[PDB]
Design a protein around this ligand. Structure first.
Ligand SMILES: [Mg+2]
Ligand SMILES: [Mg+2]
Ligand SMILES: [Mg+2]
Ligand SMILES: [Mg+2]
Ligand SMILES: [Mg+2]
Ligand SMILES: [Mg+2]
Ligand SMILES: [Mg+2]
Ligand SMILES: [Mg+2]
Lengths: 138, 337
RNA sequence: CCCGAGAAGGGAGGUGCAAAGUGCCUGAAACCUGAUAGUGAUGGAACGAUACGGCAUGAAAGGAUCUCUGGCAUGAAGGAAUCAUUCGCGAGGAUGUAGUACGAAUGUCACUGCCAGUGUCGUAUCUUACGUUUUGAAGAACGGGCCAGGGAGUGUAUCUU
RNA sequence: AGCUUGUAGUCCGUAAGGGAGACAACCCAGCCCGUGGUUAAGGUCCCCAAGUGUCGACUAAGUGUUAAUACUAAAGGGCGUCCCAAGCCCCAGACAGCUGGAAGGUUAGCUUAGAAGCAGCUACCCUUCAAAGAGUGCGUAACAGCUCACCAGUCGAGGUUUGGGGCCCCGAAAAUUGACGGGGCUCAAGUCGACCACCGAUACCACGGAGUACCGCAAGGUAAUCUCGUAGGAAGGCGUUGUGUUCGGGUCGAAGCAGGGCUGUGAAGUCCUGUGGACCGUUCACAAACGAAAAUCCUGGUAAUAGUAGCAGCAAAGCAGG
RNA sequence: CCCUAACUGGAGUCCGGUGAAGCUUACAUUCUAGUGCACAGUCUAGAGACCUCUAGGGGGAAGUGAAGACCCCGUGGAGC
RNA sequence: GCAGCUUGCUACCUCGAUGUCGGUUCUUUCCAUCCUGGCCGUGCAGCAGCGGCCAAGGGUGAGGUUGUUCGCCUAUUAAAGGAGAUCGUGAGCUGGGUUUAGACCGUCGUGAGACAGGUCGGUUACUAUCUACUAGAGGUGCCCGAGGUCUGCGGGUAAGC
RNA sequence: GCUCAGGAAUAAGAGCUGAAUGCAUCUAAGCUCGAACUCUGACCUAAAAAGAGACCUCUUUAAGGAUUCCGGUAAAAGACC
């Protein structure tokens, strides 16, 4: 299992996507609600608001609201989910808000690359804040 | 092009407009408890309409202190039985049922709806729920009630209707204790609502079958010379050249009626016990005559006669405590001719 | 002879080398009915080419130093890993190990009973049909529903090579 | 003006294959078939093969992440931030503050009463002391003080004026929902100056094979200096029907038809199995009513549409029993 | 007409019998932007989409009917 | 400098047909804000004005002339904003104008005839194959078999102004 | 006949703290308010949510479901009660 406590969003997603595609057992991202998204507050909120309200009702883009749904969607883009390889990879990913009971006390590991300590300044927001600004109870 | 502006035809806050999946209204939101323990809902069957002459007492109203005529809907409310207790758990993904305990004694006619539960665990299951609440897992408690339509005569059915209600208290322990006290008993309408208070009503509306755009959305007919050219009750245009599709917001034909609707701030004018005080000569049309206890509601109520009406205490009321209405005359004229 | 209302038609049973059963020689395709193989109700398209797999078939006309798996000898272009010395702020370089171990293929000795081929499905790369008019065609330019057959530089005189 | 008309080179037309998101004519490359190897353009976080590579700085705007390009916004400004140079004052003491001073005379010339430093001539209103003024402003008929300019005590280290550059910000508003190719990216997965390793074509190298050009009596020899192709020119072959001639096959099963095996670069040939029941080839030559996928082609057969429209409108006619 | 409502008979809807024709290279469950002979269901990148059937009005297929009647051209015609 | 909402310029697509102007019906988008919400300045006492900034949720109507768009006028009103969608919308409607064949008036021509001037008259085709949408059903997938009661990933809203 | 708010985070804007630039300064970090906008709260729909759900009861040659029959709070056919 992978703990998303204080990790960059795209860096984490890229690493997880590649080592899903390499072919192994399934992976678990827990605490997927305090992942970091570097960038100023206003710009992040603006971009996510425009992403949220963009579709048409019958067939438009249905961007999710829940935090783990957002993280799953972010990983979904770095992956050929229309092919068979990509669909099989998407079948082996499980991102949880908080800690599920069955993964309680499980052994964890982290991506040493995606670390908020590796950031120049203090210009970032946490994923749960954007989730609540988009109107989600988690 | 100098266009003349017009509000949109009909409301899109109720779409899609499809048949209700059940014949029993379901409540999505329960109010906040502000008093001693009690149920937050009740059920009954609609009969018909009359009018009463009551001394006006609405504060600050123009017609204060003088007689007025008011339309009222009479609703038959035989006593209900509290048949089970259900416990819910809160987590990230919302509430989740985690336990139920049924009453030992039940009506034999409940076998028509579901097979009768057998008396297994009653004390042990209740203490199990108590231990769960003691270890802080349970968040709220709900009661399961059903009606007993066999006592009425104007309603042909003899099979009960099962639904879930809510208990009103300021603590989970109090709700559990009250639910234990009232489990497996008969609750009368007077134990839930006080005379003169407001309520919210839900019910399935009258069904009209498939209807066209004019009667379903209230669009305009074709006027003048266009009224005799081939299209009179059809819609004008289905869309523009681009986008090359028909929008879901364009009026079209389909199901009309038999949806679930809610009415707000209906006042209760009288809690009765004897049916001879409301029954007109010759009885109500297509129903018969009232036999049990009833209740008078100011205004109209969604749904036709012989339909189940659910009641819950108000969720968006404004006005303060009103008081007991002063009913002077209740019309018992024949509804026929 | 049996069924059938039957001068309909069907079944059984005969004639004839052979049903060729009356507009009856042979009896193609489009189209229609059934059966068999592959696939199939979470799925993206010029309907295919190339390589690798699943399932089904592989009697004749195709292979028997042939199919499968390995050993040994020679091996063109190319050509490491490992270790040591040394240079560089560093990622790394140079020399030696070494043109060595390997390397398309060419021969040879055992081993095995399959391989070639055909149908359909899956995975990876690539491709927006065909003729024509056009500077430019996948075109929102024109032509064709489909199948069979028919369908377009020929003769006399004269000149030139 | 993706306008019109010239000119030099090279291309598309008639040009594959590799890379640019897709791209007639932009970059690498001009191409017979098969196998191995190394590179070009371009790239190396994931989609996607190979770097979460190295060194030194910049950007805080999601700016940017777009060789050329018909696809990318300007003048002007910025005490936004990063650099270079030039002057000026400077620890015996520069700037911002803490302070007061700005007293001599004047109430300056002023008619309105009054514009008494602040409507309207003048001039430093003191010989003199840091300061002392014809002087801005709260006040201000006029003033007046409070005090402007202007210096003085005070702290205790750098301060200040200009010019030339890099990036960014404002200037910056459009109509279905949405385009760095997408996800995303902040000491970078952006920009600038350098560097290292690897990936990546039919290019280049090696081996085998086909054809062609030219020479040679033949055997065979040479080809880094041969292998793209529309209009078009030229050479050699396959097939259909028949005639002259040579050699044959067939009721122990000809032609034809359906499906298969092998040969040939190919037009095509030959053989096998099922059906069929009477004719068919071959050597050397010669002939033609000689080869079809297309003409809103001609004739015949037959689909979908589809168990659909119609069987109502001007004369709505039938029911019981036998 | 404001502003539409109820009703009547014939069709339609449902069942039995009878029984055509016209568009058609192929495939096809789509939507947005770009690109492209500058107006794409099929290309490029995304977003969506379980399959079959019935009813319904006509948004799109630059829907079908048809070698443009408007303009020009032809050392083409006719009438006046 | 921006927009492409007026008129020009060009000739890249369409002549084996992409059915014109205005109005009507219905849906949607933009903001460069007419009213409604919030702020700043004033040569803003109050009332009411003038100028600017944020904001596209809701509203933006009834009539007389005219085919008209445009524009003028009338009485209300919080205000009676402007544009885009093949100058949205004819397999939805209308046919007033323009754009056929008939005739009259004026002006041109010797004349047949013409006007870029006026006036009167003058046929609106189709049984929906595919897709999209609006509603109603039958399957298969997940699943011990069946029934019941719930949760809520998501979708919609102007539900009030 | 009924037809509300309240709250969270914000735009223009108004302030607090505060240095670069000893002072001053709404801004460079940080913080507090602030719209008919946005979100939440009401309301309608929603296990075909492919992570394809939770709980309870009855019963596995049964529970139960359909067809026939008498009907309508429903209804184009189906479905529904
Ligand atoms: Mg040409
Ligand atoms: Mg032929
Ligand atoms: Mg060329
Ligand atoms: Mg190319
Ligand atoms: Mg040629
Ligand atoms: Mg033919
Ligand atoms: Mg000529
Ligand atoms: Mg139309």
């Amino acid at each position: 299992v992978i703990d998303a406590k204080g990790l960059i969003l795209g860096r984490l997603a890229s690493s997880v996507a590649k080592q899903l595609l390499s072919g192994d057992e399934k992976v678990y991202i827990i605490n997927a609600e305090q992942a970091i998204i570097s960038g100023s507050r206003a710009a992040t909120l603006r971009e996510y608001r425009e992403t949220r309200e963009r579709g048409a009702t019958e067939f438009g883009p249905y961007f999710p609201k829940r935090p783990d749904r957002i993280l799953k969607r972010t990983i979904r883009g770095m992956l050929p989910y229309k092919r068979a390889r990509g669909r099989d990879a998407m079948s082996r990913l499980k991102v949880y808000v908080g800690v599920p009971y069955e993964l309680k006390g499980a052994e964890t590991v982290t991506i040493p690359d995606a670390d908020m300590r590796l950031l120049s300044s203090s210009r970032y927001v946490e994923l749960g804040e954007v989730s609540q600004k988009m109107g989600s109870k988690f | 092009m100098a266009s003349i502006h017009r509000p949109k035809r009909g409301s899109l806050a109720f779409s899609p407009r499809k048949r209700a999946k059940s014949h029993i209204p379901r409540f999505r939101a329960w109010p906040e408890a502000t008093g001693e323990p009690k149920l937050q809902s009740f059920a009954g069957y609609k009969v018909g309409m009359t009018h009463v002459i009551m001394v006006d007492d609405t504060k600050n109203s123009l017609t204060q202190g003088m007689e007025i005529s008011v339309p009222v809907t009479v609703i038959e409310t035989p006593a209900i039985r509290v048949a089970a207790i259900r416990a819910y758990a809160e987590d990230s993904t919302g509430e989740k049922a985690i336990a139920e305990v049924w009453a030992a004694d039940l009506d034999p006619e409940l076998k028509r709806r579901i097979p009768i539960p057998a008396a297994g665990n009653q004390a042990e299951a209740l203490e199990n729920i108590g231990k769960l609440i003691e270890e802080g897992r349970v968040s709220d408690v709900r009661a399961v009630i059903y009606t007993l339509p066999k006592s009425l005569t104007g309603v042909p059915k003899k099979v009960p209707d099962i639904m879930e209600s809510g208990i009103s208290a300021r603590d989970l322990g109090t709700k559990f204790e009250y639910s234990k006290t009232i489990l497996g008993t008969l609750v009368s309408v007077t134990d839930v609502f006080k005379n003169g208070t407001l309520v919210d009503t839900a019910a399935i509306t009258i069904g009209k079958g498939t209807q066209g755009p004019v009667k379903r959305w209230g669009i305009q007919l074709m006027k003048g010379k266009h009224s005799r050219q081939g299209s009179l009750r059809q819609v004008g245009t289905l869309g523009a050249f681009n986008p090359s599709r028909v929008s879901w917001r364009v009026p079209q034909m389909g199901q009309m009626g038999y949806h679930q609707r809610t009415e707000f701030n209906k006042r209760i004018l009288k809690i009765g016990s004897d049916g001879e005080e409301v029954t007109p000569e010759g009885g109500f049309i297509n129903y018969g005559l009232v036999r049990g206890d009833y209740i008078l509601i100011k205004g109209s109520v969604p749904g036709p006669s012989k339909r189940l009406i659910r009641l819950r205490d108000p969720i968006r009321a404004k006005k303060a405590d009103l008081g007991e209405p002063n009913i002077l005359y209740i019309s018992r004229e024949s509804k026929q001719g």
